Design an enzyme around this catalytic site. Structure first.
Site, short mmCIF file in Angstrom:
data_model
loop_
_atom_site.label_atom_id
_atom_site.label_comp_id
_atom_site.label_asym_id
_atom_site.label_seq_id
_atom_site.Cartn_x
_atom_site.Cartn_y
_atom_site.Cartn_z
N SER A 1 30.40 41.27 28.46
CA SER A 1 31.70 41.58 27.84
C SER A 1 31.59 42.97 27.18
CB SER A 1 32.12 40.49 26.85
OG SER A 1 33.50 40.59 26.53
N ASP B 1 38.04 36.33 35.91
CA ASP B 1 37.73 36.66 34.52
C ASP B 1 38.71 37.82 34.10
OD1 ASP B 1 36.71 37.58 32.04
OD2 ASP B 1 34.66 37.94 32.86
N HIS C 1 35.34 33.89 31.99
CA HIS C 1 34.53 34.86 31.26
C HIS C 1 33.23 34.35 30.69
CE1 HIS C 1 33.96 38.64 29.17
NE2 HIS C 1 34.15 38.12 27.96
#
Ligand SMILES: *[C@@H]1O[C@H](CO)[C@@H](O)[C@H](O)[C@H]1NC(C)=O
Length: 269
Positions: A146, A201, A258
């Site tokens: 991320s 995602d 994610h």
């Protein structure tokens, strides 16, 4: 499809990325062994992997992660913690594009990511460089999930070209800058970026192309589902700056996707 060797690497650095979320791995004494709560990082635990430096809310950007020495795999690993947050970091960090000509001419990068890296770059450069001197046969790898993967990407782009390679493995990373920066990250010498995405995602779809952002090529797209174990046949290499064959498709995005990059990531306490 990817090779078993590349698969093993992707899996390993996904777990180094996961390990950066465990709170004990951001305040660990140097020289201690890296472990994770539960089953977040068995591939890391099974190695002789120890902390060189563990950091929390470091610099004005409040960057969190660790630098590891892995004798089993002959690695120097800088792993940046990302965020739980799917969307809110759009509201909470400056997505204006800031000039980064000192990284590459005409390049612009996310203000937040770039500023954050800059605030810790001198300290972390010196630690990485000391480790390289002590272990010149070890591979330097920067990684993160991320926003941590964004930090790893910026950091690698900045620190390459100083006599040791830096490979970057990012998992579910947002776009980090403009087309010039994406082009630079596609061709830059002195190491390889492996930019890994999962199904739909939402995070790699942000910030929007229409905020002036582009993705580097290639993309390693994991097509297997959330909570589905990944095989080498489930990873497709997608070529082209801003290619639309992988994660970058005009369909509904997803937040749970994610959190699953080989295993659960972002969930280690
Ligand atoms: C750290 O792990 C190694 C094996 O990888 C082991 O020999 C050592 O005893 C561990 N250290 C502690 C403090 O448990």
């Amino acid at each position: 499809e990817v090779s078993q060797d590349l698969f093993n690497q992707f899996n390993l650095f996904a777990q180094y990325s996961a390990a950066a979320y465990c709170g004990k791995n951001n305040d660990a004494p140097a020289g201690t062994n890296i472990t994770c709560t539960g089953n977040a990082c068995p591939e890391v635990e099974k190695a002789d992997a120890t902390f060189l430096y563990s950091f929390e809310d470091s610099g004005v950007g409040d960057v969190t992660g660790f630098l590891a020495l892995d004798n089993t795999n002959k690695l120097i690993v800088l792993s940046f913690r990302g965020s739980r947050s799917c969307e809110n970091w759009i509201g909470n960090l400056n997505f204006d594009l800031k000039e980064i000509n000192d990284i590459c001419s005409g390049c612009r990068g996310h203000d937040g990511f770039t500023s954050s890296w800059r605030s810790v770059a001198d300290t972390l450069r010196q630690k990485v460089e000391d480790a390289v001197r002590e272990h010149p046969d070890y591979r330097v790898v920067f990684t993160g999930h991320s926003l941590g993967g964004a930090l790893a990407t910026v950091a690698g782009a900045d620190l390459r070209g100083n006599g040791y390679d830096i490979d970057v493995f990012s998992y579910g990373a947002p776009r980090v800058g403009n087309r010039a920066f994406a082009e630079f990250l596609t061709v830059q010498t002195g190491g390889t970026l492996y930019r890994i995405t999962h199904t739909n995602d939402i995070v790699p779809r942000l910030p929007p192309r229409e905020f002036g952002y582009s993705h580097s090529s290639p993309e390693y797209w994991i097509k297997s589902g959330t909570l589905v174990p990944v095989t080498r046949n489930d990873i497709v290499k997608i070529e082209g700056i801003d290619a639309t064959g992988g994660n970058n498709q005009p369909n509904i995005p997803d937040c749970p996707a994610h959190l699953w990059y080989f295993g659960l990531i972002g969930t280690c306490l």
